[PDB]
Amino acid sequence: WTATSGSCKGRCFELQEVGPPDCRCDNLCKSYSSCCHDFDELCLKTARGWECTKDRCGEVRNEENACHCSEDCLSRGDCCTNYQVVCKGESHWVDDDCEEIKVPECPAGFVRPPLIIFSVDGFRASYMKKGSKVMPNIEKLRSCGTHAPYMRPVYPTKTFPNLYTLATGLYPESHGIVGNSMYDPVFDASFHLRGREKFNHRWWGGQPLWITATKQGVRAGTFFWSVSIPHERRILTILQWLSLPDNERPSVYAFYSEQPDFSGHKYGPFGPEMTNPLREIDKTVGQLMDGLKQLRLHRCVNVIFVGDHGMEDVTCDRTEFLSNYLTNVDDITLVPGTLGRIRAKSINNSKYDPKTIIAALTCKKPDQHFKPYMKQHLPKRLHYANNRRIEDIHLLVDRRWHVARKPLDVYKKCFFQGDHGFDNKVNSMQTVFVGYGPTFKYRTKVPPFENIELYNVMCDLLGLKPAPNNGTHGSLNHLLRTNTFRPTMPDEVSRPNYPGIMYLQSEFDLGCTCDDKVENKLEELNKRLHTKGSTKERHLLYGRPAVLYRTSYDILYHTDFESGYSEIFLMPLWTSYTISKQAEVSSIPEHLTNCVRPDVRVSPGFSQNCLAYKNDKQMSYGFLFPPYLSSSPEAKYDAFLVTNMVPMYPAFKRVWAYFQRVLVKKYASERNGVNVISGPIFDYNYDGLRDTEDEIKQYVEGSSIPVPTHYYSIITSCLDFTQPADKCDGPLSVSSFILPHRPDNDESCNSSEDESKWVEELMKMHTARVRDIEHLTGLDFYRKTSRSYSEILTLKTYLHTYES
Ligand SMILES: *[C@@H]1O[C@H](CO)[C@@H](O[C@@H]2O[C@H](CO)[C@@H](O[C@H]3O[C@H](CO[C@H]4O[C@H](CO)[C@@H](O)[C@H](O[C@H]5O[C@H](CO)[C@@H](O)[C@H](O)[C@@H]5O[C@H]5O[C@H](CO)[C@@H](O)[C@H](O)[C@@H]5O)[C@@H]4O)[C@@H](O)[C@H](O[C@H]4O[C@H](CO)[C@@H](O)[C@H](O)[C@@H]4O[C@H]4O[C@H](CO)[C@@H](O)[C@H](O)[C@@H]4O)[C@@H]3O)[C@H](O)[C@H]2NC(C)=O)[C@H](O)[C@H]1NC(C)=O
Ligand SMILES: CS(=O)(=O)N1Cc2cnc(N[C@H]3Cc4cc(Cl)cc(C#N)c4C3)nc2C1
Ligand SMILES: [Ca+2]
Ligand SMILES: [Ca+2]
Ligand SMILES: [K+]
Ligand code: NA
Ligand SMILES: [Zn+2]
């Protein structure tokens, strides 16, 4: 209940919201049906529209008018945004030459440059080029400020998940807004775009920027606007707030536009009806910038122009129906559209079986337009699993398609031509970033980056300490003229052991065999040098990775590779090796097919054993340094050490052997050498973070050898490919992957074919950032380079996306 009989007199767009039953006058009161009875009359004036005309110049103030053109309007802070152009002979901001903003040029009383976020819904990255002729204000921000060719959203590429990620720096799995529709089984409560449940604070985790500001003594404008408040009124409200007294005035603001998303759903991303929404957004940017110029704030404020996600062509005919796959379609609940989420319709139904649902949805139709996953098996780059609001069964829907439960869902609820929500690496889902102002760089292009990184920068722009988040603070320092964040590398927690030869062959009872009895002080000296690390500078190009947790591990040197060997997990944490462009691929010799060799540097008690693999009928083994890329027949024996072995399902060995035998050489050929760091990952609780030993759910039968959930590789070369990877003077280039260690190839519908037709497609889907592997391993890479630490942080956030 609300006492609407109160009044908004002197309260219009008040910044602190009052508590029920008191009536409200803030920018969200309409959304709560709680505005005072006189809110429209006092706070949403429309009379005479939004623009000064020559006849209004120097008018007697009429308080009924939407905006003013009276001599007192700049003093009151309520001029129409074109007042000085129409009435005082000024230019529009967009008609002024770009002039570098080297320092903030702020009115007396401004303690810091304000930040204004201009957020646009559904603004696809390619609109910046394709719509340039109709967006002059936006094109001036873009060309004169700092811009990226695109900004990568989070998955799912829906509105609330992405806006709340912009606000928090968190993945959706961490902030809790995992879709635009959600069921929380602990709350037994449903979140929808329509209705009141979504206003309950229990949905919204993390700490959004307006809370971070307020807690640190920086005042914020409210970021949410009720839909019926016209954009012109939103702009005039921001400009009026910027005219408040110093002690009352916010330092951070947000504008929001529902366009171009609203029209893009109706007309498609490039429908001819899309030009007018782009022109209208541009005009709104112009009102803001002319308004700031009037207030002498246009060389004071930092402006961010940012979108939440893009927009794809999607029509009602491109819908897959689960009723064409499942016997049991009435026993499931589907969250449908550009992603699927499946759970039981009733938790009382004991016949419900996720395994039979997955199997019925797997590679059943030749051009099937979705792929089912258990959420832990989703590509790790999506970071879409560690939340009870994310159903165990997920459908990744192909771009341009929908999934629905039954056909009647699509026509008993069409005409739409656009949608979004797909995999956040899809080109059509990419969105925009421009930063303009004193704290941003001038006429600067930056590479694409992820929207999780922006919260830290907005905190930098406001002098705030960010709440703990999933950005990598410093990775976006190259956007900024000033207020850079200069972190120190994390401290190494565990120092390695450097074991020498300590064990005789006969002390090992591992059940291993190798045909390696083949008896020269020239080479015997060389053998010793290689075991002491004489080739380590070729194979360890960027320093030893640092271990950022407490453990026991050994550095093991070899002719062709170096490893950090865990005495706790009985296998390497990392294996590092360099493959030149000139490297030769060889076979595993016939006599060595089943060769495994004890490592006389490592105790039998801290070694794997071959008998466990013989007894475990499901599990086989592979090697981290590939025997195919040995430098010589003699060096190849090192590759068969028990300390280089890792557990691998036979199905996974098809993937891994193709990577090692074909793809590493291909990348060395293409990139002018590569350095490879490979290793295991254990994430049985799918939280994106290194498991401790007591979290491991599977061992090699009858042993303490833990089974990885994933295998990674980090593949580094010189960005200037005219220099070989091992003699690179400048910036680096990286690609990485986190491959799921699965006992079948059910994810790859063409896996019956030769690996040349499916394995690289699998690896592209599971592309990763170095930072993703850092979280999953507790390792810190690139500790010893010639490069600035912020440049290395940017490299660690890079994702190789494999889009055209
Ligand atoms: C992205 O960046 C984020 C932010 O840095 C980071 O997430 C942080 O990860 C930490 C490890 O998973 C975790 O640390 C402690 O969490 C709780 C305290 O949690 C509450 O308080 C904080 C601080 O204000 C809140 O932010 C937090 O919000 C979460 O829960 C809300 C209510 O559910 C929810 O609204 C909100 O969205 C958020 O949920 C998310 O995180 C939770 C986990 O907290 C997930 O479950 C959700 O699915 C969702 O993902 C809370 O209100 C501490 O209690 C923990 O300590 C445990 O566990 C330790 C084990 O290592 C142990 O040593 C401790 O003794 C203690 O154990 C006890 O409890 C166990 C579990 O119940 C029990 O089994 C055991 O026997 C014993 O009794 C953690 O130290 C942070 O909460 C988390 N923050 C946020 C914001 O998510 C992400 O990891 C990265 N991502 C990547 C990939 O890098
Ligand atoms: C889903 S929707 O259509 O129902 N909807 C209505 C509505 C109203 N105002 C806004 N304002 C945005 C402006 C902004 C900027 C940044 Cl950086 C982070 C966040 C967050 N968080 C927001 C909220 N957004 C929406 C999204
Ligand atoms: Ca949106
Ligand atoms: Ca984990
Ligand atoms: K076996
Ligand atoms: Na298959
Ligand atoms: Zn939309």
UniProtKB/Swiss-Prot annotation:
Q: Which residues bind Ca(2+)?
A: 683, 685, 687, 689, 691
Q: Which positions are annotated as binding Zn(2+) 1?
A: 121, 159, 308-309
Tissue and organ expression note: Abundantly expressed in cerebrum and cerebellum. Localized in secretory epithelial cells in the brain and the eye including choroid plexus epithelial cells, ciliary epithelial cells, iris pigment epithelial cells, and retinal pigment cells.
Q: What effect is documented for mutating residue 380 to A?
A: Impaired secretion. No effect on lysophospholipase activity
PANTHER family linked: ECTONUCLEOTIDE PYROPHOSPHATASE/PHOSPHODIESTERASE, ECTONUCLEOTIDE PYROPHOSPHATASE_PHOSPHODIESTERASE FAMILY MEMBER 2
UniProt region (Nuclease-like domain), positions on chain: 541-804
EC number from the UniProt entry: 3.1.4.39, 3.1.4.4
Residue limits of the SMB domain? 4-47, 48-92
Q: What is this protein called?
A: Autotaxin
The UniProt similarity line reads:
Belongs to the nucleotide pyrophosphatase/phosphodiesterase family.
Q: Which residues form the active site?
A: 159
EC main group: hydrolase
Indicate the principal place this protein occupies in or around the cell: secreted
Domain description: The nuclease-like domain is most probably catalytically inactive as residues that are essential for catalysis in the DNA/RNA non-specific endonucleases are not conserved. However, it is required for the stability of the protein and the catalytic activity born by the Phosphodiesterase domain.
Compartments, record wording: Secreted
- Post-translational modifications: N-glycosylation, but not furin-cleavage, plays a critical role on secretion and on lysoPLD activity. The interdomain disulfide bond between Cys-363 and Cys-749 is essential for catalytic activity.
Q: Where is this region: Phosphodiesterase?
A: 94-447
* Record-level Gene Ontology MF annotations: alkylglycerophosphoethanolamine phosphodiesterase activity; calcium ion binding; lysophospholipase activity; nucleic acid binding; phosphodiesterase I activity; phospholipase D activity; polysaccharide binding; scavenger receptor activity
Q: Which organism is it from?
A: Rattus norvegicus (Rat)
List the catalytic activities from the record. a 1-O-alkyl-sn-glycero-3-phosphoethanolamine + H2O = a 1-O-alkyl-sn-glycero-3-phosphate + ethanolamine + H(+); a 1-acyl-sn-glycero-3-phosphoethanolamine + H2O = a 1-acyl-sn-glycero-3-phosphate + ethanolamine + H(+); 1-(9Z-octadecenoyl)-sn-glycero-3-phosphoethanolamine + H2O = 1-(9Z-octadecenoyl)-sn-glycero-3-phosphate + ethanolamine + H(+); a 1-O-alkyl-sn-glycero-3-phosphocholine + H2O = a 1-O-alkyl-sn-glycero-3-phosphate + choline + H(+)
Quote the record's binding site residues for 1-(9Z-octadecenoyl)-sn-glycero-3-phosphate. 159, 180, 261, 420
